[PDB]
Ligand binder design. Structure first.
Ligand SMILES: NC(=O)c1ccc[n+]([C@@H]2O[C@H](COP(=O)([O-])OP(=O)([O-])OC[C@H]3O[C@@H](n4cnc5c(N)[nH+]cnc54)[C@H](O)[C@@H]3O)[C@@H](O)[C@H]2O)c1
Ligand SMILES: NC(=O)c1ccc[n+]([C@@H]2O[C@H](COP(=O)([O-])OP(=O)([O-])OC[C@H]3O[C@@H](n4cnc5c(N)[nH+]cnc54)[C@H](O)[C@@H]3O)[C@@H](O)[C@H]2O)c1
Ligand SMILES: [Zn+2]
Ligand SMILES: [Zn+2]
Ligand SMILES: [Zn+2]
Ligand SMILES: [Zn+2]
Lengths: 374, 374
């Protein structure tokens, strides 16, 4: 039995940037008040986890990364009311405290308790529940899912359907929800519209799914890797373009293709240049462009504000605009009710011990989502 | 007595950047098919007219500037159906052709026939109706209201109430409608919200009017000229701040004043740095910032896209988002019914012949709107 006790378990520790993960034994403290200890069942490899490795996304090291996951509650701390031992859960990398001005706002979801703006790499109380070789190890986004067990604050966990297939619904913890919500909630794609999606990875494919669900007439996928095009068409892209195939800048190409600019564009890569291209290719008077890709640390883009003065709208969002704790259980229920598909995103399923191989598949261009199973 | 004839009249010709206007005789050709010749009654001095002088807003020279005005139709060309001789009219610097994709779109107002995005300084047929000293003179935004007579395309004029006071309602041709619409239509300011308005000239005061009409609880005016504060409070500012008074950057000040960022911010100046400051000061998860000011020609701003990724919305608009020909007559009718006030904007009245004094008043910081009478 493990409740109230330190657990020794396997985790993937990142000791420094640009190194493989180290799979080794960690100690996981029991949960304090308003904390939840979770036995991991499956976790996805999101490009944002690779950003921690590459130093694109700065967070304190050493760290247990991983934020797209699902598992089963092993134990609860004093005062927890929202989950119980044995419940299936999804950790929430964007918390929902329910008390801050953002949580109380009808359209806000970036709760002020997040650890993304100004990452500390701790629990809410400023301390870590992880040690490895006698050293404290940082948390990541209040989740840290590259471990057989994690501890999360109550505001960073949602209870989901007991009959949930966790090897699929772990994608509702980041990539599916982000892309789908970016289309249906943040952009509010309209029926009959023309959309352009920059980046056809797991998140970009989820954007396509949402644009098709919203009734877009045309969905143009844009990627420099033409191997991504077949799956993009399977999930709703009406045509795909590779910028490398053209002499002109792709914003000019997309403007021409859409007879004067697209209704909605999405940046789902994480490059400054594609953020500006995606804004430019939306119609100058009424177009909307949404930034989804995480930009490189501390780098500014350059743009001409006449792109906005003519009437464009530019916005971004975390986690598809979804209020996390309210939304994740409903998304799982909707998945169970066959409202959307997750299998198109899953290209590889590996044991957790093969995490590095899973990252190598992402980096080589050869996977969409690898799901790691504990 | 002048239908079909060239009219010789006085106009304010700008021969050179950074020089006074020259009040001198021009020849005004009669209207061609689908053109309208207007006897001007009143015209306002908008900062954008000054931008032509300063080279902030590039348009071909020599030019007859002026775009905020009202007059009486002197004659109509073949095929004109929407105005008649003797009608009161407001020239529309943003046309409404009614046929392009923007005009057909429910939100769009920046008609594709505009002469603002890539100014040519002509009529829609690519020619000029003005001669001065035997030389062709450019038009400005299809309006050219600094002339006793102008000729406009039919899509650039609206018929207004016959009982209209033209010396007031000329402001509906630019500054009032732009500011008011930026608040009520583009930003969609909500009841009980906190707004920040950067720049307290005629347009920024009109933004304040719109924020107060929408029910904002707090309206923070921001200007480096504290002489602008008294009028801003008269039209609805709850408080005014001068960035020069503070050690910290004003985005930090406004974030602290609003307990974490404002709901809606407006850039109503035309500076790259205040466009980024105005974005930053709106709440990071759900704030909206609207660019109204005209930026210096061909210059790019630099910004961190994390400001958008957290959830901010950034947009701009021309003419307050109003579809011009539909909206201008309705705005005039609402003015006549006392639904808004224009007198607070009018600080000086001069004859047209004193146009250069009117520009001096704007440049010194003394005036809001000077109205020139023909
Ligand atoms: N906003 C959020 O909440 C959120 C959530 C999840 C992911 N992200 C970010 O979203 C981005 C995509 O994540 P993912 O789908 O897991 O990544 P991914 O699977 O690496 O997909 C990125 C795609 O972009 C393509 N690409 C790379 N460079 C270019 C280019 N120059 N032009 C066109 N295509 C290009 C690339 O070939 C690949 O198919 C990353 O930056 C993530 O960090 C953000
Ligand atoms: N988008 C449109 O359709 C549209 C329409 C009309 C005007 N404009 C532009 O809107 C802007 C305002 O026009 P206006 O009200 O006639 O001009 P204005 O009367 O010159 O007002 C501008 C105000 O900005 C203040 N100001 C200058 N620098 C700063 C600073 N650094 N910080 C804070 N305040 C500062 C200044 O003191 C003045 O009161 C100009 O750039 C116009 O070209 C745009
Ligand atoms: Zn919160
Ligand atoms: Zn992610
Ligand atoms: Zn049009
Ligand atoms: Zn103007």
């Amino acid at each position: 039995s493990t409740a109230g006790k330190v657990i020794k378990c396997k985790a993937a520790v990142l000791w420094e940037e640009k190194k493989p993960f180290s799979i080794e034994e960690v100690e996981v403290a029991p949960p304090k008040a308003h904390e939840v200890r979770i036995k991991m069942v499956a976790t996805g490899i999101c490009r944002s986890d690779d950003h921690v490795v590459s130093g694109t996304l700065v967070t304190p090291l050493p760290v247990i990364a991983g934020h797209e996951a699902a598992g089963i509650v092993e134990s609860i701390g004093e005062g927890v009311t929202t989950v119980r031992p044995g419940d299936k859960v999804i950790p929430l990398f964007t918390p929902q405290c329910g008390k801050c001005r953002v949580c109380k706002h009808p359209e806000g979801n970036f709760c002020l308790k997040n650890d993304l703006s100004m990452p500390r790499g701790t629990m809410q109380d400023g301390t870590s529940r992880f040690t490895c070789r006698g050293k404290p190890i940082h948390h990541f986004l209040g989740t840290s899912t590259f471990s057989q067990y994690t501890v999360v604050d109550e505001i960073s966990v949602a209870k989901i359907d007991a009959a949930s297939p966790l090897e699929k619904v772990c994608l509702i913890g980041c990539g599916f929800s982000t892309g789908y919500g970016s289309a249906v909630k943040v952009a509010k794609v309209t029926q009959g519209s023309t959309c352009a999606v920059f980046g056809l990875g797991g998140v970009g494919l989820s954007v396509i799914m949402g644009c098709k669900a919203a009734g877009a007439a045309r969905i143009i996928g844009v990627d420099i890797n033409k191997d991504k095009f077949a799956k993009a068409k399977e999930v709703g892209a009406t045509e795909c373009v590779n910028p490398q195939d053209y002499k002109k800048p792709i914003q000019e190409v997309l403007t021409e293709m859409s007879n004067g600019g697209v209704d909605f564009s999405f940046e789902v890569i994480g490059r400054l240049d594609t953020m500006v291209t995606a804004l430019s290719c939306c119609q100058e008077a009424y177009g909307v462009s949404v930034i989804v890709g995480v930009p490189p640390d501390s780098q500014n883009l350059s743009m001409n504000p006449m792109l906005l003065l003519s009437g464009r709208t530019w916005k971004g969002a975390i986690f598809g605009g979804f209020k996390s704790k309210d939304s994740v259980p409903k998304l799982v229920a909707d998945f169970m009710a066959k409202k959307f598909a997750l299998d198109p995103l899953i290209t590889h399923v590996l044991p957790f011990e093969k995490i590095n191989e899973g990252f190598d598949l992402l980096r080589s261009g050869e996977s969409i989502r690898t799901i790691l199973t504990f």
